């Protein structure tokens, strides 16, 4: 019962079509035909680091 402020805030709204902004997921290929950037695979004592 007892009373907080809070504060509404927008962090997006509409978008174009086909247009990149902050906060999407994607994958980083590199090259020509088949190369993106990646981590080391399960175990493999590379520590994913």
Not at 1 to 27: A, K
Request: aromatic letters at 8%; a negative charge; charged letters at 20%.
């Amino acid at each position: 019962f007892m009373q907080t402020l809070w504060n509404m805030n927008p962090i997006c709204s509409c978008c174009e079509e086909g247009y990149v902004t902050g906060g999407h997921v994607l994958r980083l290929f590199h090259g020509h035909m088949d190369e993106c950037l990646t981590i080391s695979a399960a175990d493999s004592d590379d520590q994913r680091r």
